[model samples]
Target: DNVMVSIGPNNTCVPASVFENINWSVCSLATRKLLVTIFDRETLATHSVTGKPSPAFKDQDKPLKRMLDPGKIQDIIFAVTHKCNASEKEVRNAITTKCADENKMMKIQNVKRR
Candidate 1:
Protein backbone atom coordinates (compact mmCIF):
# COMPACT_ATOMS: atom_id res chain seq x y z
CA ASP A 1 0.00 0.00 0.00
CA ASN A 2 2.07 2.87 -1.34
CA VAL A 3 1.72 5.76 -3.73
CA MET A 4 3.72 6.23 -6.93
CA VAL A 5 4.40 9.92 -7.42
CA SER A 6 6.02 11.01 -10.69
CA ILE A 7 7.85 14.27 -11.30
CA GLY A 8 10.31 15.11 -14.66
CA PRO A 9 11.28 16.44 -18.00
CA ASN A 10 10.31 20.03 -17.61
CA ASN A 11 10.89 23.30 -15.84
CA THR A 12 10.16 21.51 -12.57
CA CYS A 13 11.94 18.09 -12.64
CA VAL A 14 11.52 14.45 -11.71
CA PRO A 15 13.63 12.22 -9.54
CA ALA A 16 16.34 10.02 -11.03
CA SER A 17 15.66 6.68 -12.70
CA VAL A 18 17.58 5.11 -9.87
CA PHE A 19 14.42 5.24 -7.73
CA GLU A 20 12.56 3.15 -10.23
CA ASN A 21 15.46 0.84 -11.00
CA ILE A 22 17.39 0.23 -7.79
CA ASN A 23 14.41 0.10 -5.43
CA TRP A 24 12.24 -2.09 -7.56
CA SER A 25 10.67 -3.98 -4.66
CA VAL A 26 9.57 -0.93 -2.71
CA CYS A 27 9.49 1.63 -5.53
CA SER A 28 8.32 0.07 -8.73
CA LEU A 29 7.88 1.43 -12.24
CA ALA A 30 5.21 -1.19 -12.78
CA THR A 31 3.07 0.22 -10.01
CA ARG A 32 0.27 2.38 -11.43
CA LYS A 33 1.72 5.35 -9.61
CA LEU A 34 5.49 5.01 -10.24
CA LEU A 35 5.47 4.65 -14.02
CA VAL A 36 6.58 7.99 -15.45
CA THR A 37 7.80 8.81 -18.92
CA ILE A 38 9.19 12.20 -19.84
CA PHE A 39 8.99 12.66 -23.57
CA ASP A 40 8.57 16.40 -24.05
CA ARG A 41 10.60 18.53 -21.74
CA GLU A 42 8.71 21.65 -22.63
CA THR A 43 5.37 20.35 -21.31
CA LEU A 44 6.17 17.96 -18.52
CA ALA A 45 3.41 15.68 -17.24
CA THR A 46 2.66 13.36 -14.34
CA HIS A 47 0.54 10.32 -13.75
CA SER A 48 -0.31 11.37 -10.21
CA VAL A 49 -2.34 14.40 -11.21
CA THR A 50 -4.38 13.11 -14.05
CA GLY A 51 -8.03 14.01 -14.80
CA LYS A 52 -7.97 16.02 -11.63
CA PRO A 53 -7.18 19.51 -10.44
CA SER A 54 -4.68 20.40 -7.74
CA PRO A 55 -5.29 23.00 -5.05
CA ALA A 56 -2.21 24.79 -6.42
CA PHE A 57 -3.65 24.85 -9.94
CA LYS A 58 -7.21 25.84 -9.14
CA ASP A 59 -6.72 29.60 -9.01
CA GLN A 60 -4.26 29.62 -11.89
CA ASP A 61 -5.74 30.54 -15.26
CA LYS A 62 -3.48 28.24 -17.21
CA PRO A 63 -3.80 24.46 -17.11
CA LEU A 64 -0.12 23.68 -17.02
CA LYS A 65 0.28 26.55 -14.64
CA ARG A 66 -1.67 24.57 -12.08
CA MET A 67 -0.15 21.29 -13.16
CA LEU A 68 2.50 19.47 -11.16
CA ASP A 69 5.61 20.43 -13.04
CA PRO A 70 8.05 17.63 -13.57
CA GLY A 71 10.30 17.24 -10.59
CA LYS A 72 13.12 14.93 -9.59
CA ILE A 73 11.64 11.49 -8.93
CA GLN A 74 12.99 11.63 -5.42
CA ASP A 75 11.53 15.10 -5.00
CA ILE A 76 9.09 15.69 -2.16
CA ILE A 77 5.42 16.16 -3.02
CA PHE A 78 4.23 16.91 0.45
CA ALA A 79 3.45 14.31 3.12
CA VAL A 80 2.19 11.80 0.61
CA THR A 81 3.89 8.89 2.31
CA HIS A 82 5.21 7.83 5.71
CA LYS A 83 8.79 8.22 4.50
CA CYS A 84 10.92 11.32 4.95
CA ASN A 85 9.44 14.71 4.26
CA ALA A 86 11.99 16.39 1.99
CA SER A 87 12.56 17.56 -1.54
CA GLU A 88 13.04 15.25 -4.51
CA LYS A 89 16.72 16.15 -4.72
CA GLU A 90 17.25 15.37 -1.05
CA VAL A 91 15.32 12.11 -1.17
CA ARG A 92 17.06 10.95 -4.32
CA ASN A 93 20.42 11.64 -2.80
CA ALA A 94 19.37 9.76 0.31
CA ILE A 95 18.74 6.65 -1.75
CA THR A 96 21.95 7.06 -3.74
CA THR A 97 23.93 7.58 -0.57
CA LYS A 98 22.15 4.64 1.05
CA CYS A 99 21.01 6.88 3.83
CA ALA A 100 17.91 4.70 3.84
CA ASP A 101 16.21 1.86 2.03
CA GLU A 102 12.56 1.68 0.88
CA ASN A 103 11.14 -0.55 3.62
CA LYS A 104 14.18 -1.54 5.59
CA MET A 105 12.88 -2.63 9.00
CA MET A 106 9.40 -3.83 8.11
CA LYS A 107 8.55 -7.35 9.18
CA ILE A 108 7.26 -9.95 6.76
CA GLN A 109 6.95 -13.72 6.53
CA ASN A 110 9.17 -15.95 4.43
CA VAL A 111 8.05 -17.35 1.09
CA LYS A 112 8.76 -20.84 2.33
CA ARG A 113 5.30 -21.82 3.51
CA ARG A 114 4.74 -25.30 4.83
Candidate 2:
Protein backbone atom coordinates (compact mmCIF):
# COMPACT_ATOMS: atom_id res chain seq x y z
CA ASP A 1 0.00 0.00 0.00
CA ASN A 2 1.33 3.43 -1.00
CA VAL A 3 0.37 6.40 1.09
CA MET A 4 1.15 9.97 0.10
CA VAL A 5 1.89 12.37 2.93
CA SER A 6 2.40 16.05 2.33
CA ILE A 7 3.46 18.37 5.11
CA GLY A 8 2.28 21.95 5.15
CA PRO A 9 3.82 25.13 6.50
CA ASN A 10 1.74 24.73 9.64
CA ASN A 11 3.48 21.41 10.38
CA THR A 12 0.34 19.41 9.61
CA CYS A 13 0.48 16.38 7.39
CA VAL A 14 -2.21 15.54 4.88
CA PRO A 15 -2.79 14.08 1.45
CA ALA A 16 -1.12 15.90 -1.44
CA SER A 17 -4.56 16.69 -2.81
CA VAL A 18 -5.62 18.27 0.45
CA PHE A 19 -2.38 20.23 0.65
CA GLU A 20 -2.96 21.72 -2.79
CA ASN A 21 -6.48 22.75 -1.83
CA ILE A 22 -5.36 25.49 0.53
CA ASN A 23 -6.60 28.89 -0.67
CA TRP A 24 -3.58 31.19 -0.54
CA SER A 25 -5.43 34.30 -1.66
CA VAL A 26 -6.81 35.18 1.79
CA CYS A 27 -3.22 35.64 2.96
CA SER A 28 -1.06 38.68 2.23
CA LEU A 29 1.52 38.45 -0.56
CA ALA A 30 4.36 38.00 1.91
CA THR A 31 2.45 35.31 3.78
CA ARG A 32 1.67 33.52 0.53
CA LYS A 33 5.35 33.54 -0.39
CA LEU A 34 6.26 32.11 2.99
CA LEU A 35 3.68 29.35 2.65
CA VAL A 36 4.82 28.59 -0.88
CA THR A 37 8.41 28.38 0.27
CA ILE A 38 7.47 26.08 3.08
CA PHE A 39 5.49 23.91 0.71
CA ASP A 40 8.47 23.75 -1.63
CA ARG A 41 10.74 22.71 1.22
CA GLU A 42 8.37 19.99 2.27
CA THR A 43 7.94 18.84 -1.31
CA LEU A 44 11.67 18.47 -1.65
CA ALA A 45 11.83 16.45 1.55
CA THR A 46 9.04 14.19 0.34
CA HIS A 47 10.60 13.92 -3.09
CA SER A 48 13.63 12.22 -1.60
CA VAL A 49 11.41 9.51 -0.18
CA THR A 50 8.87 9.21 -2.99
CA GLY A 51 11.31 9.89 -5.85
CA LYS A 52 8.78 12.11 -7.60
CA PRO A 53 8.96 15.66 -8.80
CA SER A 54 7.19 18.05 -6.48
CA PRO A 55 4.60 20.54 -7.56
CA ALA A 56 5.82 23.98 -8.62
CA PHE A 57 5.00 27.03 -6.60
CA LYS A 58 4.81 30.51 -8.06
CA ASP A 59 4.36 33.86 -6.35
CA GLN A 60 1.51 35.80 -7.89
CA ASP A 61 1.89 39.48 -8.78
CA LYS A 62 -0.49 41.55 -6.69
CA PRO A 63 -2.05 44.86 -7.63
CA LEU A 64 0.09 47.95 -7.04
CA LYS A 65 -1.01 51.36 -5.70
CA ARG A 66 0.13 54.53 -7.50
CA MET A 67 -0.81 57.11 -4.88
CA LEU A 68 1.44 59.16 -2.60
CA ASP A 69 -0.62 59.21 0.58
CA PRO A 70 0.47 58.59 4.15
CA GLY A 71 -0.36 55.00 5.27
CA LYS A 72 -0.17 54.45 1.48
CA ILE A 73 -2.93 53.82 -1.03
CA GLN A 74 -2.72 50.06 -0.59
CA ASP A 75 -3.32 50.50 3.13
CA ILE A 76 -6.36 52.64 2.38
CA ILE A 77 -7.59 50.09 -0.13
CA PHE A 78 -7.41 47.31 2.45
CA ALA A 79 -8.94 49.49 5.16
CA VAL A 80 -11.89 50.47 2.99
CA THR A 81 -12.25 46.94 1.73
CA HIS A 82 -12.47 45.69 5.30
CA LYS A 83 -14.63 48.45 6.79
CA CYS A 84 -17.18 48.87 3.99
CA ASN A 85 -16.75 45.53 2.19
CA ALA A 86 -16.47 47.69 -0.90
CA SER A 87 -15.08 46.86 -4.30
CA GLU A 88 -11.67 48.10 -5.39
CA LYS A 89 -13.32 50.74 -7.55
CA GLU A 90 -15.32 52.00 -4.56
CA VAL A 91 -12.20 52.12 -2.42
CA ARG A 92 -10.48 54.13 -5.12
CA ASN A 93 -13.31 56.65 -5.12
CA ALA A 94 -13.05 56.99 -1.35
CA ILE A 95 -9.30 57.59 -1.56
CA THR A 96 -9.75 60.16 -4.31
CA THR A 97 -12.38 62.00 -2.30
CA LYS A 98 -10.13 62.01 0.78
CA CYS A 99 -7.16 63.38 -1.14
CA ALA A 100 -9.28 66.05 -2.76
CA ASP A 101 -10.64 67.13 0.63
CA GLU A 102 -7.15 67.26 2.10
CA ASN A 103 -5.89 69.33 -0.78
CA LYS A 104 -8.83 71.74 -0.48
CA MET A 105 -8.20 72.12 3.26
CA MET A 106 -4.51 72.81 2.66
CA LYS A 107 -5.33 75.42 0.03
CA ILE A 108 -7.88 77.12 2.29
CA GLN A 109 -5.33 77.23 5.17
CA ASN A 110 -2.56 78.51 2.88
CA VAL A 111 -0.44 75.52 3.86
CA LYS A 112 2.68 75.06 1.69
CA ARG A 113 5.17 72.24 1.71
CA ARG A 114 8.85 72.98 2.32
Candidate 3:
Protein backbone atom coordinates (compact mmCIF):
# COMPACT_ATOMS: atom_id res chain seq x y z
CA ASP A 1 0.00 0.00 0.00
CA ASN A 2 1.17 3.53 -0.79
CA VAL A 3 -0.03 6.53 1.13
CA MET A 4 0.59 10.25 1.42
CA VAL A 5 0.02 11.83 4.79
CA SER A 6 -0.93 15.45 5.39
CA ILE A 7 -1.32 17.17 8.73
CA GLY A 8 -2.66 20.54 9.81
CA PRO A 9 -2.25 22.90 12.74
CA ASN A 10 -2.22 20.89 15.94
CA ASN A 11 -3.19 23.98 17.91
CA THR A 12 -6.61 24.28 16.32
CA CYS A 13 -9.67 23.87 18.54
CA VAL A 14 -11.66 20.63 18.41
CA PRO A 15 -15.41 20.13 18.83
CA ALA A 16 -17.14 19.37 22.15
CA SER A 17 -18.74 16.20 20.84
CA VAL A 18 -15.28 14.67 21.05
CA PHE A 19 -15.64 14.62 24.82
CA GLU A 20 -19.04 12.93 24.98
CA ASN A 21 -17.51 9.90 26.67
CA ILE A 22 -16.01 12.00 29.44
CA ASN A 23 -17.54 13.09 32.73
CA TRP A 24 -18.60 16.57 31.63
CA SER A 25 -19.45 17.97 35.06
CA VAL A 26 -15.76 17.80 35.95
CA CYS A 27 -14.49 19.41 32.75
CA SER A 28 -14.68 22.99 31.48
CA LEU A 29 -15.05 23.92 27.80
CA ALA A 30 -11.36 24.58 27.12
CA THR A 31 -10.26 21.56 29.11
CA ARG A 32 -12.38 19.30 26.95
CA LYS A 33 -10.66 20.37 23.73
CA LEU A 34 -7.21 19.88 25.18
CA LEU A 35 -8.17 16.42 26.40
CA VAL A 36 -9.21 15.24 22.94
CA THR A 37 -5.86 15.97 21.28
CA ILE A 38 -3.87 14.64 24.19
CA PHE A 39 -5.85 11.41 24.16
CA ASP A 40 -5.24 10.91 20.47
CA ARG A 41 -1.51 11.54 20.78
CA GLU A 42 -1.21 9.14 23.69
CA THR A 43 -2.97 6.44 21.72
CA LEU A 44 -0.53 6.91 18.86
CA ALA A 45 2.42 6.61 21.23
CA THR A 46 1.71 3.07 22.41
CA HIS A 47 5.33 1.96 22.42
CA SER A 48 5.66 1.95 26.23
CA VAL A 49 2.04 2.08 27.28
CA THR A 50 0.73 -0.66 29.56
CA GLY A 51 -2.62 -1.86 30.85
CA LYS A 52 -3.89 -1.40 34.43
CA PRO A 53 -6.99 -1.32 36.60
CA SER A 54 -9.36 1.58 37.05
CA PRO A 55 -9.17 3.45 40.35
CA ALA A 56 -12.81 4.54 40.28
CA PHE A 57 -14.20 1.50 42.08
CA LYS A 58 -14.35 1.85 45.87
CA ASP A 59 -15.55 -1.43 47.35
CA GLN A 60 -13.43 -4.56 47.27
CA ASP A 61 -16.33 -6.44 45.70
CA LYS A 62 -16.30 -4.13 42.70
CA PRO A 63 -13.98 -4.99 39.85
CA LEU A 64 -11.17 -2.59 38.98
CA LYS A 65 -11.13 -1.38 35.39
CA ARG A 66 -8.04 -0.71 33.31
CA MET A 67 -6.08 2.50 33.93
CA LEU A 68 -7.24 4.07 30.67
CA ASP A 69 -10.02 3.58 28.25
CA PRO A 70 -8.13 4.03 25.01
CA GLY A 71 -11.01 6.04 23.61
CA LYS A 72 -11.57 8.26 26.64
CA ILE A 73 -7.93 8.49 27.58
CA GLN A 74 -7.34 11.07 24.84
CA ASP A 75 -10.16 13.20 26.18
CA ILE A 76 -8.68 13.09 29.65
CA ILE A 77 -5.22 13.98 28.42
CA PHE A 78 -6.59 16.90 26.41
CA ALA A 79 -8.41 18.20 29.46
CA VAL A 80 -5.41 17.86 31.72
CA THR A 81 -3.10 19.47 29.20
CA HIS A 82 -5.35 22.51 28.87
CA LYS A 83 -5.58 22.68 32.66
CA CYS A 84 -1.86 23.42 32.62
CA ASN A 85 -0.69 27.03 33.09
CA ALA A 86 0.80 27.48 29.63
CA SER A 87 -0.96 29.28 26.81
CA GLU A 88 -2.40 27.39 23.81
CA LYS A 89 0.67 27.86 21.60
CA GLU A 90 2.96 26.95 24.45
CA VAL A 91 1.03 23.85 25.37
CA ARG A 92 0.77 22.70 21.76
CA ASN A 93 4.42 23.30 20.97
CA ALA A 94 5.35 21.42 24.10
CA ILE A 95 3.31 18.47 22.91
CA THR A 96 4.67 18.61 19.38
CA THR A 97 8.17 18.90 20.79
CA LYS A 98 7.81 15.83 22.97
CA CYS A 99 6.17 13.91 20.16
CA ALA A 100 8.99 14.79 17.81
CA ASP A 101 11.67 13.51 20.15
CA GLU A 102 10.19 10.13 20.98
CA ASN A 103 8.55 8.93 17.76
CA LYS A 104 9.66 11.43 15.11
CA MET A 105 6.37 10.72 13.42
CA MET A 106 5.45 14.41 13.57
CA LYS A 107 7.28 17.72 13.89
CA ILE A 108 6.57 21.42 14.03
CA GLN A 109 8.81 21.94 11.07
CA ASN A 110 8.25 25.66 10.74
CA VAL A 111 6.22 28.56 12.01
CA LYS A 112 4.37 30.36 9.25
CA ARG A 113 2.99 33.61 10.48
CA ARG A 114 1.15 36.52 8.90
Candidate 4:
Protein backbone atom coordinates (compact mmCIF):
# COMPACT_ATOMS: atom_id res chain seq x y z
CA ASP A 1 0.00 0.00 0.00
CA ASN A 2 2.92 2.37 0.64
CA VAL A 3 4.02 2.21 -2.98
CA MET A 4 0.59 2.63 -4.68
CA VAL A 5 -1.86 4.87 -2.80
CA SER A 6 -2.76 8.19 -4.37
CA ILE A 7 -6.03 9.63 -5.72
CA GLY A 8 -5.95 9.57 -9.51
CA PRO A 9 -7.89 8.84 -12.66
CA ASN A 10 -9.53 5.46 -11.96
CA ASN A 11 -7.19 5.14 -9.02
CA THR A 12 -4.28 5.27 -11.41
CA CYS A 13 -2.34 4.05 -8.41
CA VAL A 14 0.93 5.88 -8.53
CA PRO A 15 3.51 6.60 -5.80
CA ALA A 16 1.84 7.62 -2.53
CA SER A 17 4.69 10.03 -1.75
CA VAL A 18 3.33 12.57 -4.25
CA PHE A 19 0.11 13.00 -2.21
CA GLU A 20 1.92 14.38 0.82
CA ASN A 21 1.66 17.96 -0.53
CA ILE A 22 -1.98 17.87 -1.68
CA ASN A 23 -5.09 19.62 -0.34
CA TRP A 24 -8.85 19.11 -0.38
CA SER A 25 -9.85 21.65 -3.04
CA VAL A 26 -11.53 20.88 -6.33
CA CYS A 27 -13.61 22.16 -9.31
CA SER A 28 -15.75 20.85 -12.22
CA LEU A 29 -18.21 21.39 -15.12
CA ALA A 30 -21.84 22.45 -15.73
CA THR A 31 -25.58 21.90 -14.87
CA ARG A 32 -28.73 23.15 -13.08
CA LYS A 33 -32.12 21.93 -11.57
CA LEU A 34 -33.44 21.51 -15.11
CA LEU A 35 -31.29 19.67 -17.66
CA VAL A 36 -33.29 17.18 -19.71
CA THR A 37 -33.99 16.64 -23.39
CA ILE A 38 -37.75 16.08 -23.18
CA PHE A 39 -39.00 14.32 -26.23
CA ASP A 40 -41.99 15.63 -28.14
CA ARG A 41 -42.41 12.06 -29.46
CA GLU A 42 -43.49 14.04 -32.46
CA THR A 43 -40.86 16.74 -33.11
CA LEU A 44 -38.19 15.55 -30.62
CA ALA A 45 -37.38 19.07 -29.39
CA THR A 46 -34.94 19.27 -26.48
CA HIS A 47 -35.19 21.83 -23.68
CA SER A 48 -32.47 22.88 -21.29
CA VAL A 49 -33.35 26.53 -21.64
CA THR A 50 -33.57 25.61 -25.31
CA GLY A 51 -35.58 23.23 -27.52
CA LYS A 52 -34.02 21.97 -30.73
CA PRO A 53 -34.86 18.58 -32.14
CA SER A 54 -32.45 15.80 -31.29
CA PRO A 55 -31.84 14.82 -34.89
CA ALA A 56 -32.64 12.00 -37.27
CA PHE A 57 -31.04 10.31 -40.24
CA LYS A 58 -31.72 7.66 -42.85
CA ASP A 59 -28.12 7.54 -43.93
CA GLN A 60 -29.87 10.61 -45.17
CA ASP A 61 -30.91 13.01 -42.37
CA LYS A 62 -29.54 14.60 -39.18
CA PRO A 63 -30.14 18.23 -38.30
CA LEU A 64 -26.51 18.85 -37.36
CA LYS A 65 -28.38 21.08 -34.93
CA ARG A 66 -25.91 20.93 -32.10
CA MET A 67 -24.88 23.72 -29.77
CA LEU A 68 -24.07 23.85 -26.03
CA ASP A 69 -22.45 27.16 -25.35
CA PRO A 70 -21.48 27.96 -21.76
CA GLY A 71 -22.36 31.48 -20.77
CA LYS A 72 -25.00 33.67 -19.03
CA ILE A 73 -26.43 31.15 -16.56
CA GLN A 74 -26.37 28.39 -19.10
CA ASP A 75 -27.64 24.90 -18.47
CA ILE A 76 -25.24 22.30 -19.77
CA ILE A 77 -26.78 20.34 -22.65
CA PHE A 78 -25.69 16.85 -23.62
CA ALA A 79 -27.20 13.65 -25.06
CA VAL A 80 -26.60 10.12 -26.24
CA THR A 81 -28.20 7.49 -28.51
CA HIS A 82 -27.06 5.03 -31.09
CA LYS A 83 -25.51 7.22 -33.82
CA CYS A 84 -26.46 5.27 -36.87
CA ASN A 85 -28.48 6.32 -39.89
CA ALA A 86 -32.21 5.83 -39.22
CA SER A 87 -35.41 7.64 -40.05
CA GLU A 88 -36.94 10.06 -37.53
CA LYS A 89 -40.09 7.95 -37.16
CA GLU A 90 -38.02 4.83 -36.65
CA VAL A 91 -35.99 6.12 -33.67
CA ARG A 92 -37.94 6.35 -30.45
CA ASN A 93 -37.82 9.63 -28.56
CA ALA A 94 -36.36 9.68 -25.01
CA ILE A 95 -35.97 12.02 -22.02
CA THR A 96 -32.94 12.28 -19.79
CA THR A 97 -33.78 14.04 -16.47
CA LYS A 98 -30.61 12.31 -15.50
CA CYS A 99 -29.31 13.91 -18.67
CA ALA A 100 -27.17 16.59 -17.03
CA ASP A 101 -26.42 17.35 -13.38
CA GLU A 102 -24.28 19.70 -11.36
CA ASN A 103 -22.83 16.64 -9.74
CA LYS A 104 -24.00 13.05 -9.79
CA MET A 105 -23.52 9.54 -11.19
CA MET A 106 -23.74 9.79 -15.01
CA LYS A 107 -26.05 7.80 -17.25
CA ILE A 108 -27.28 8.08 -20.85
CA GLN A 109 -29.72 5.51 -22.14
CA ASN A 110 -31.89 4.75 -25.19
CA VAL A 111 -33.61 2.02 -27.22
CA LYS A 112 -36.02 1.30 -30.09
CA ARG A 113 -39.14 -0.69 -29.33
CA ARG A 114 -42.61 -0.82 -30.78
Q: Compared with the true structure, what per-residue lDDT tens digits does model 3 show for residues 31-108?
A: 434443445644433322224333565455643222334334443344445444434444444443343343344223
In angstroms, what RMSD does candidate 2 have relative to the true structure? Answer: 20.3
lDDT of each: 0.32, 0.39, 0.38, 0.26
Better of 1 and 2 by lDDT: 2
lDDT by residue (1-114, candidate 1, tens digit) is: 343434422233234552344332332222213323332322222222222555676777643322333343323332213233334444343332221121121111122332
Cα error, residue 42 of model 3, in Å, equals 9.6
Clashing pairs in 4: 57-61
Error of 2 at 101 (Å): 0.8
**Which residue pairs in candidate 2 collide?**
none
Model 1 lDDT at residue 80 = 16
| Root-mean-square deviation of every model | 17.4, 20.3, 17.3, 16.7
Global Cα lDDT for candidate 4: 0.26
lDDT of 2 by residue, 53-99 (tens): 32442354422223342233454344335544567666555434443
Sort order, TM-score high to low: 2, 3, 1, 4
Q: For residues 55-108, could you state the per-residue lDDT of candidate 4 as single tens digits?
A: 454355543433232231121122111122332222222122322231122112
Among these predictions, the greatest TM-score belongs to 2
The whole-model C-alpha lDDT of candidate 1 against the native structure comes to: 0.32
